[PDB]
């Protein structure tokens, strides 16, 4: 917006208009994949630290 060099942002918009965005199914599958991964590791690690805490708790 400032002097003296012109905003190349228009180009950054122009070359953004020629961008092919992923389909619906790709977004859904990707989201569900991330969800599955994260949920899995979260549950597994949760169980891990849980039973580890409850096991160490016996040593007093």
């Amino acid at each position: 917006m400032f002097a003296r060099l012109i905003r190349y942002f228009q180009e950054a918009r122009a070359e953004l208009a020629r961008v092919t965005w992923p389909t619906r199914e790709q977004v859904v599958e990707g989201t569900q994949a991330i969800l599955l991964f994260t949920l899995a590791f979260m549950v597994i690690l949760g169980l891990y630290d849980t039973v580890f805490r409850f096991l160490i708790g016996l040593l007093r």
Partner: protein
């Protein structure tokens, strides 16, 4: 990229990798309960409640929750990440190592060795430094009864942390070797996602007591879903440059008629680099607790406060853009085009091709970097508006989770594609 989740669990070959990963993560989380000899944990956990100890959050998140429990891996792999960053710096400065790096992989292995050694030495240094400043300047405010703030305690802490970061680094290497995804990546990812379930549980437990509004939590979770779908939709976005070649004996193609260029590389490395960078001043100012000025300049970089969040966003955008720009080499694609007779309609194969490639990439990656910066900014704002407050659900945390998940799944799927044809 997408799915490849069930088939990866059906196949025994990948199932061994997965189970091995889970085993190493189990050993990690089990070793996270073995406290550093001579350290009072309850007083640390009590210290992390005040505003003077809240700034430790950003450091505690990347420790895998090891700081508050002060395990043998108290600082996590973050000393090795810092050692990697510093290694990049030193590589840039003095070319005595870049000559070896130019001598082939034989020098690259040297760079790696010195990186790891730098990591262990940073374990020693940071351990001794914390033990000297944070643990006994008060003094003895975090020391177990019967432990003196002398050379003995420092010795014990050092000896503990050195073998700690050593063993942890080895574990990361073994994950990188016999397991899916990157070692350090999956370890940091694990260290973040561990805290997720108890947060949700305690939140639900806080709902019924009329302490937290159910609507706030629901909208928060919905925002998490939207963030997931958003980053998942952005990471898979790409610009496709059509190339036609080559009628005659030069071709024929015969091959892919388009070059894909994405906003994200994708890489989980950048935001981790930026994380360590943001952590350094905080890690250097926090131990001197009694000094007010250092506490002030430490709170200046706090990812929760506007200043630190601003710096964090800038770091994320910058590192993302730079990394994405560096990973994509126009030279190799261009020479591949020239050799294969590849001709992009409008220009001639050679230097103008890489000039135009840069001309598009530079205009393109900006929106991706700005997007990741947005994912860095928005969550803290939502938390500032909604009732929920957790640095485990911060911007950079979501960036790490999504990044590592996408990376691992993409790699696995890629290996499946490779074994296919």
């Amino acid at each position: 990229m997408v799915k490849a989740f069930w088939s990866a669990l059906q196949i025994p070959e990948l199932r061994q990798r997965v189970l091995f990963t889970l085993l190493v993560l189990a050993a990690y989380r089990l070793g996270a309960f073995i406290p550093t000899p001579g350290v009072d944990l309850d007083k640390i956990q009590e210290f992390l409640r005040t505003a003077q100890g809240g700034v430790f959050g950003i450091i505690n998140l990347f420790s895998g929750g090891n700081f508050e429990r002060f395990s043998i891996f108290a600082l996590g792999i973050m000393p090795y990440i810092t050692a990697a960053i510093i290694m990049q710096i030193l590589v840039t400065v003095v070319p005595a190592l870049e000559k070896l790096s130019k001598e082939g992989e034989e020098g690259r292995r040297i760079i790696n060795q010195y990186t790891r050694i730098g990591g262990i030495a940073l374990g020693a240094f940071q351990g001794f430094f914390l033990a000297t400043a944070f643990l006994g300047a008060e003094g003895g405010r975090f020391l177990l009864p019967g432990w003196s703030p002398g050379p003995f305690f420092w010795f014990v802490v050092v000896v503990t942390q050195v073998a700690g970061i050593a063993l942890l680094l080895w574990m990361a290497e073994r994950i990188t070797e016999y397991g899916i995804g990157n070692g350090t990546s999956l370890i940091i990812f694990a260290g973040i996602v561990v805290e997720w379930l108890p947060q949700i549980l305690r939140t639900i437990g806080l709902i019924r007591t009329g302490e937290v509004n159910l609507v706030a939590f629901l909208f928060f979770l919905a925002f998490i879903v939207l963030a997931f779908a958003g980053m998942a939709a952005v990471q898979q976005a790409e610009r496709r440059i059509p190339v036609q070649y080559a009628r005659g004996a030069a071709g024929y193609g015969g091959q892919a008629t388009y070059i894909p260029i994405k906003l994200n590389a994708a890489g989980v490395i950048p935001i981790i680099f930026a994380a360590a960078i943001l952590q350094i001043p905080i890690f250097l100012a926090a131990p001197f607790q009694d000094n007010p000025v250092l506490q002030g300049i430490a709170n200046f970089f706090n990812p929760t406060r506007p200043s630190g969040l601003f710096i964090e966003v800038l770091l994320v955008i910058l590192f993302t853009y730079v990394y994405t720009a560096v990973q994509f080499d126009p030279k190799r694609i261009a020479e591949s085009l020239r050799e294969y007779g590849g001709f992009i309609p409008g220009i001639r194969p050679g230097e103008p091709t890489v000039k135009f490639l840069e001309h598009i990439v530079s205009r393109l990656t900006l929106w991706g970097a700005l997007f990741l910066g947005l994912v860095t900014l928005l969550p803290q704002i939502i938390q500032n508006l909604t009732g929920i407050h957790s640095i485990a659900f911060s911007g950079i945390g979501l960036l790490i989770v999504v990044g590592v998940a996408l990376d691992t799944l993409r790699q696995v799927e890629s290996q499946l594609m490779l074994r296919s044809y």
